[PDB]
Design a protein around this ligand. Structure first.
Ligand SMILES: CCCS[C@@H](CC1C=CN(C)C=C1)c1cccc2ccccc12
Ligand code: NA
Length: 578
């Protein structure tokens, strides 16, 4: 009645997780390091040993909590991360290209979008969104929907805070780096699209007035999390700033009326604008990255949403955005938020502009549309499209870099209460056997044998996927054992100080499938300096890859990786056509 009917997240058996862990890492560490890790794990999991003690504590935690990993996972994946949110953390979703002859066309789109946000939020708030079922079925957790609009991520010196929340409700409109409170309710009557248009015109006019222009405070939210915690602490010394921060913290979402980009509106360029606004000289300060959703409606027709994803993952977000876009197809003045700055704040602003520009220049990003085939061909090979593509990315990484690396693939655990994600470790032993056969010409493995190895790697990938989505994989389980150990003693046991364990969690290849039904697509940066981010959207006859890496790292190249992906998909096609 008041409590969820969903199952709780399972706790895997301890020995199952330790065995899977060792077999995951054997081929990714040296033989000497692996021998040491084998003995460490044996001691940790011995009868009556520490692992068994921690496992008992984890089963007590499962009984006392709705989800035993929620707190640890939120802190480990997001709130402890000190990197600036743009590129490093906040994914971008790019909508179909739009065409706005005049400003009023841009404003009519933004008015229509805001109206759809208000309608969707009314469905949400009255619990009218139909329960998702697995594979589009077993019911899925719906809690992430309540985090789409009611969430604000506060910076902290060492750990951030995720705050959940209002009479009336308002959005914040960002224009020319200025922020305006737009109430979306007058006399308890929701503003119509026409009223919203009229209000947005008032905002664009006020934002263009240089005598009222205020400093670009939003730039500070683009900095490292400890840097922005420090600058925000300066701001909150003044009551005007506290009032303005409070208005942003409690808004529904941001709507960002970006200026024209001046670059060709390719898919790659539109994505760059959604990821980091092009830096301070372009739209990079027209942002507030702590707020969960920042819809961008650019003057030139670049539209999308920038997502702070501590409160929700991408499947729920795409459900929301597709509903918004599909249903677009079917009076007091807004208040400028004022700011009281100091010489301190000017220094923080200049430093944030410089730090953001390093991120802009460092990001190597490419949108690559593979057009030779898609899901239809892959399914004719008795393969899951996701597993086939994951194996292709392993072959791409191996043929370019001549090793496999610890790889992350998001797996939804929404089958369980409060469920977010666990990790599918796609760098399997079977994937290694396959990529070596394909690339080692002197070994002269027959194509017929490469095909057997291909299908066994796809089998192993599919098996790991089922394991992860049913709560039986290893990353969340080890995370909880680690953090329960830390509560006993700040000195972690050797199990988690082991270089094999640290190595295992540096995801040089970080991936996810985010399928969409419209022309929209999702992207994000890498999670380690020598890594890639790879987000793909498989369609019946094509596959879209968004590949990121950092220009600082001489080993990686997004262009070269996309070419290796193409060659791998062609190789796999030829093997399946024997
Ligand atoms: C379970 C479905 C995908 S969850 C997340 C995946 C992910 C994101 C970043 N890295 C580095 C690696 C993986 C994600 C992807 C794309 C867009 C998102 C938008 C909002 C929220 C999450 C999004
Ligand atoms: Na690079």
């Amino acid at each position: 009645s008041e409590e969820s009917g969903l199952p709780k997240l399972p706790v895997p058996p301890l020995q199952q997780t330790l065995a899977t862990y060792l077999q995951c890492m054997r081929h990714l560490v040296s033989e000497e390091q692996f021998r040491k890790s084998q003995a460490i794990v044996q001691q940790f999991g011995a009868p009556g040993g520490l692992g068994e003690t921690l496992q008992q504590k984890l089963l007590e935690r499962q009984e006392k909590t709705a989800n035993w990993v929620s707190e640890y996972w939120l802190n480990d994946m997001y709130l402890n991360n000190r990197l600036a949110l743009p590129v490093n953390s906040s994914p971008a979703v790019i909508f179909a290209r739009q065409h706005f002859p005049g400003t009023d066309d841009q404003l009519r789109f933004a008015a229509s979008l805001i109206s759809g946000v208000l309608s969707y939020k009314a469905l949400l708030d009255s619990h009218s969104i139909p329960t998702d079922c697995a594979k589009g079925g077993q019911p899925l957790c719906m809690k992430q929907y309540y985090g789409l609009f009611s969430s604000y991520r506060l910076p902290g010196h060492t750990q951030d805070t995720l705050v959940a929340q209002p009479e009336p409700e308002h959005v914040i409109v960002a224009c020319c780096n200025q922020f305006f409170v737009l109430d979306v309710v007058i006399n308890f009557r929701r503003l119509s699209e026409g009223d919203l248009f009229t209000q947005l015109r008032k905002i664009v006019k006020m934002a263009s007035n240089a005598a009222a222009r205020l400093p670009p405070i939003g730039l500070l939210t683009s900095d490292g999390r400890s840097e922005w915690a420090e600058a925000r602490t300066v701001l909150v010394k003044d009551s005007t700033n506290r009032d303005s921060l409070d208005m942003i913290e409690r808004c529904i979402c941001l709507v960002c009326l970006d200026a024209p980009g001046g670059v060709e509106l390719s898919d790659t360029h539109r994505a760059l604008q959604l990821l980091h606004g092009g830096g301070y000289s372009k739209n990079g300060a027209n942002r507030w990255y702590d707020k969960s959703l920042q819809f961008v409606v650019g003057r030139d027709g670049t539209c999308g949403v920038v997502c702070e994803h501590s409160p929700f993952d991408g499947i729920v977000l795409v459900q929301c955005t597709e509903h918004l876009l599909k249903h677009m197809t079917q009076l007091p003045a807004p208040r400028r938020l004022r700011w009281k700055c100091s010489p301190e704040i000017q220094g923080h602003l200049a430093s944030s502009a410089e730090k953001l520009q390093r991120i802009v220049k460092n990001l190597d990003f490419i949108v690559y549309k593979f057009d030779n085939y898609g899901k239809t061909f892959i399914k004719k090979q008795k393969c899951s499209p996701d597993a086939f593509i994951q194996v292709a990315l392993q072959l791409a990484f191996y043929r370019l870099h001549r090793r496999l690396v610890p790889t992350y693939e998001s797996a939804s655990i929404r089958r369980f209460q409060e469920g977010r994600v666990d990790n599918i470790r796609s760098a399997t032993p079977e994937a290694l056997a396959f990529v070596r056969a394909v690339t080692d010409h002197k070994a002269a493995v027959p194509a017929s044998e490469k095909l057997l190895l291909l299908k066994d790697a796809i089998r192993a990938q599919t098996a790991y996927t089922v394991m992860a989505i049913t709560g039986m994989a290893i990353d969340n389980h080890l995370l909880a054992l680690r953090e329960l150990a830390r509560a006993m003693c700040a000195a972690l046991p050797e199990m988690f100080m082991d270089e094999t364990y640290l190595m295992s969690n540096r995801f040089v290849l970080s991936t996810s499938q985010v399928p969409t039904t419209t022309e929209m697509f999702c992207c994000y940066g890498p999670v380690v300096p020598n890594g890639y981010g790879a987000c793909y959207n498989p369609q019946p006859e094509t596959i879209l890859f968004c590949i990121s890496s950092f220009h600082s790292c001489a080993a990686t190249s997004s262009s070269k990786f996309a070419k290796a992906v193409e060659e791998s998909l062609i190789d796999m096609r030829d093997l399946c056509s024997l």
